Design a protein around this ligand. Structure first.
Ligand SMILES: [Y+2]
Ligand SMILES: [Zn+2]
Length: 390
């Protein structure tokens, strides 16, 4: 078929919502398992499938790379260069940093030389490149992203100046070097040093109102003994309205705290943890991979561009592109020179290719091979597309 309706994997990670995908999309969950991620793509660990027998989308692409992916993508990447997820964060998730291109090459090589299997838990670097990443809110979405302006951090730390000398040290000279030292010191707190700092913070949670104190309170219910409880004082806390997006830069701490979002990423990721985790953190390595530069709140959301019915979220990389398409009862053409995945965000989409018609209800998606572009879309609501602009 010109258009293939996707059968998609749901990862039942412990932190997933037992209800979100069901409430939003009618996805069946009689056993009430947590449903953390809905995967749309051709990841080797759990590829989407297409149908008349059921086959792996990854296997299908592999047998016909130029036709399915297009020449550009078959040339540059040799596979589907993106994985498209719905993320349902029912609990706050760990603070993460993605290393830059240079350090990714190094860490990938270190782990390869040490013989760490690629799918081992210990494995942090799975790509010799820095892989860019876009998050797009489906429901209101609470997250952290990047360091706040220094004067903001100063105001926020004053109520907890006594928690640790590193905090006092930073307040004395609020610069990048001392921000770095503060971040390392907080992460390295041990025993009674750590418990003292946490007791100061929790006392502050009784006499401070509103954000980011409220976010700290929320996080403390899941990570009551974590030095990452200080992080909303250092990192921008953001509440994305549905339809807003952020592009996560290298060397920049971020965390997803609550809500449902679409995420576009490469198949293989590099991740260093920076708090909100029971796992070991190599602090020197983390610190060597973080850029201690503020990012102003006005710069956090990616600014999309509307042209006709299309809203593009321009991304500073070749690997993938992301757009939203307003559906109308009159057809519009959606074309690209690559493979595309189309996902019904809301309303209902009818896709047409010549004589073939395919209906997607919210939460459903289709794969369109490069050879099959363009398709005509009509209906109501919005269709999200991941594809490649090359
Ligand atoms: Y991610
Ligand atoms: Zn990330």
């Amino acid at each position: 078929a010109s258009m293939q309706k996707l059968i998609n994997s749901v990862q039942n990670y412990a932190w997933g919502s037992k209800t979100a995908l069901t409430e939003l999309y009618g996805i069946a969950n009689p056993q009430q398992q947590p449903m953390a991620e809905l995967w749309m793509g051709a990841h080797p660990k759990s590829s989407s499938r297409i149908t008349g027998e059921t086959v792996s989308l990854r296997d299908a692409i592999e047998k016909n790379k130029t036709a399915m992916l297009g020449e550009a993508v078959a040339n540059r990447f040799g596979e589907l260069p993106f994985l498209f997820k719905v993320l349902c964060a029912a609990q706050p998730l760990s603070i993460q940093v993605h290393p830059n291109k240079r350090n990714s090459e190094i860490g990938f090589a270190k782990e390869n030389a040490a013989g760490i299997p690629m799918d081992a838990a210990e494995r942090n670097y799975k790509d010799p490149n820095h892989k860019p990443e876009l998050v797009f809110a489906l429901t209101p979405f609470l997250a952290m992203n990047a360091f706040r302006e220094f004067s903001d951090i100063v105001s926020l730390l004053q109520p907890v100046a006594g928690a640790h000398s590193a905090i006092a040290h930073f307040l004395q000279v609020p610069n990048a070097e001392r921000l770095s030292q503060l971040f390392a010191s907080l992460l390295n707190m041990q025993g009674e040093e750590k418990s003292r700092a946490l007791a100061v913070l929790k006392a502050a949670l009784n006499s401070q109102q509103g954000e980011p104190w409220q976010t700290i309170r929320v996080i403390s219910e899941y990570y009551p003994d974590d030095s990452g409880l200080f992080s909303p004082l250092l990192l921008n806390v953001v509440k994305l309205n549905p339809g807003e997006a952020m592009f996560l830069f290298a060397e920049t701490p971020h965390a997803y705290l609550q809500g449902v979002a679409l995420e576009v990423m490469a198949n293989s990721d590099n991740v260093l943890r920076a708090g909100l985790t029971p796992k070991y953190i190599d602090i020197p390595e983390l610190v060597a991979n973080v850029k201690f530069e503020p990012k102003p709140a006005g710069e956090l959301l990616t600014a999309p561009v509307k042209s006709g019915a299309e809203l593009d979220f321009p991304i500073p990389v070749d690997d993938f592109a992301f757009s939203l398409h307003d559906l109308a009862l009159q057809e519009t053409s959606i074309g690209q020179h690559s493979a595309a995945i189309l996902f019904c965000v809301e309303g209902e989409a009818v896709l047409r290719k010549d004589e073939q018609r395919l209906v997607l209800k919210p939460g459903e998606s289709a794969f369109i091979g490069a050879d099959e572009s363009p398709v005509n879309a009509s209906g109501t609501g919005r269709l999200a597309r991941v594809y490649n602009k090359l």
